[PDB]
């Protein structure tokens, strides 16, 4: 079954221990390098690929929302060759997207992330599919043209992500516009390093506030440009 | 929200890796000492306190069904003094009810238990309360009378659980009727060692196939008798 993407009201947060956990979980997801420096090896927070409005994280259709995610695990992973839990999946995002180290599976910060994801999933039937889950891929027949992609990047992306892909810092030292390549970006093991996933994300979410504005060809070619560049190597 | 206790159809099991996991999970829950001997320190399987029909485990109202349990975690534990995950909760049942050792939080058998619980929870909204969850307690004002309880035990329980509480083995060496005290029963750390929980279980589920037949006084007193006896000590 597919159900709608619903976002709960932060005014109806439970109190007690669970509410305090949810609030800490939102912070870990929004501000991950500063909150979890022992585990993060780049400049990315979860929210840089799992954006949300109103200070929430992971609430946007076609940008891998967390709404409903708790009810989809455990599930099979071809990386692992077996079923994995949601804790383990978060571990892989720390190791790959954040170029870091997985939290222990009972670490309190990991549990607070889980509590926040569960809060966002409230009312979703276990096993159901949320409309707008994941990042829909975009695939062309034909190798991306990074020459075209370089021209598109300069015209549509550079002002935010920079001529050297290094992003723009905000006043408090967190990325306002995150790095797309180089030492502070996602590593080679990340899902965003796959052509069709980057092309899909770009097509649906970029340029910022212009969702679904690039033609399919343009998203494909600019993703290819972006992925020509060096970034940290995953072991 | 409270929703109904629904049990899925084993004929509609998913295939692939998830279906194979679910099936292994049902076996670990039904036949735990034989399947997980490194982790089990008594004669109990999960199904001896979380019974189910038709070979399922954890599907009976007022006998702590697993239907819906996945959507109730993480939650606060006063034992731990913080939020815990469902994997951690299962660990505590291994340590206390099964007098053993917790599985590692990524152990494949634990994940297969989780997969089975998730399958049983299919369609339950995350966060909802399933009708018949847990084991409703029964509490009297007044200390249980174990003299009364001994007479009730002889008349209503002994034929199955034995004069020495040691249970009845089946032909394949698993308990048909499980031990209520002594070295093969639950340890002192288990929830069933608490007077009001044992009284509630008994009242709602015992004698077998005579749910809600003891008066409240009778359940209370027989639970008290049962809990006068030695059993393994929890560290
Ligand atoms: C971009 C560089 C990412 C960063 C930073 C983080 N994640 Fe991610 N995540 C990313 C992709 C491309 C995907 C795949 C989407 C799909 O179609 O399924 C994911 C997925 C997840 C998931 C699974 C979601 C699902 O529906 O199954 C989770 C739980 C997840 N990501 C969590 C997560 C966390 C907690 C992060 C910070 C530690 C994180 N991700 C960063 C891309 C990126
Ligand atoms: C500023 C107004 C932006 C423009 C123009 C573009 N992007 Fe962007 N991007 C921006 C933000 C604020 C974020 C974080 C997520 C959000 O949706 O809030 C992003 C994220 C990305 C990512 C993922 C994260 C990462 O790799 O660091 C990618 C791959 C990305 N953006 C690419 C991209 C491209 C190719 C653009 C031109 C077509 C583009 N972005 C424009 C902000 C802005
Ligand atoms: C009786 C001696 C038990 C054995 C054997 C096992 N469990 Fe148990 N479990 C027992 C009690 C008395 C309770 C509390 C019920 C309540 O009202 O909440 C539990 C609870 C659980 C739970 C949590 C259920 C919930 O709704 O939150 C789980 C997940 C659980 N038990 C699992 C479990 C497993 C997997 C077992 C075998 C390893 C196991 N239990 C054995 C009593 C007994
Ligand atoms: C045989 C027909 C039984 C009679 C009579 C009684 N019990 Fe029982 N009990 C029986 C089974 C098959 C099981 C497993 C769970 C099931 O519902 O399938 C149980 C379980 C218990 C337990 C929990 C497990 C344990 O501690 O080992 C308790 C505490 C228990 N039973 C107590 C109990 C008492 C006090 C009875 C007389 C009032 C009684 N049981 C009768 C089978 C049978």
Author numbering:
A (entry chain A), B (entry chain A): 31 to 265
Quote what the paper states about this structure.
The presented structure was determined to 1.3 Å resolution from crystals grown at pH 4.6. In this structure, Cys123 is present as a cysteine S-sulfane conjugate rather than the cysteine S-thiosulfonate adduct expected from reaction with tetrathionate. The heme iron of the N-terminal domain heme is coordinated by the sulfane atom of the Cys123-S-sulfane conjugate and by His80. The ligands to the heme in the C-terminal domain are Met236 and His191. The active site of TsdA co-crystallized with tetrathionate contains density that is well interpreted as a molecule of thiosulfate at 46% occupancy. The presence of thiosulfate in the crystallization environment is expected because it is formed as a product of the initial thiosulfonation of Cys123 by tetrathionate (Reaction 6). The thiosulfate molecule has bonding interactions with the amino acid side chains of Arg109, Arg119, and Ser127 as well as with the main chain amide group of Gly221 from the electron transfer domain.
TsdA comprises two cytochrome c-like domains connected by a long unstructured linker. Each cytochrome domain contains one covalently bound heme molecule. The structural environment of the two hemes suggests a model for electron transfer in TsdA in which the electrons derived from thiosulfate oxidation are initially accepted by the heme in the N-terminal “catalytic” domain before being passed to the heme in the C-terminal “electron transfer” domain and then to an external electron acceptor protein positioned on the surface of TsdA near the exposed heme edge.
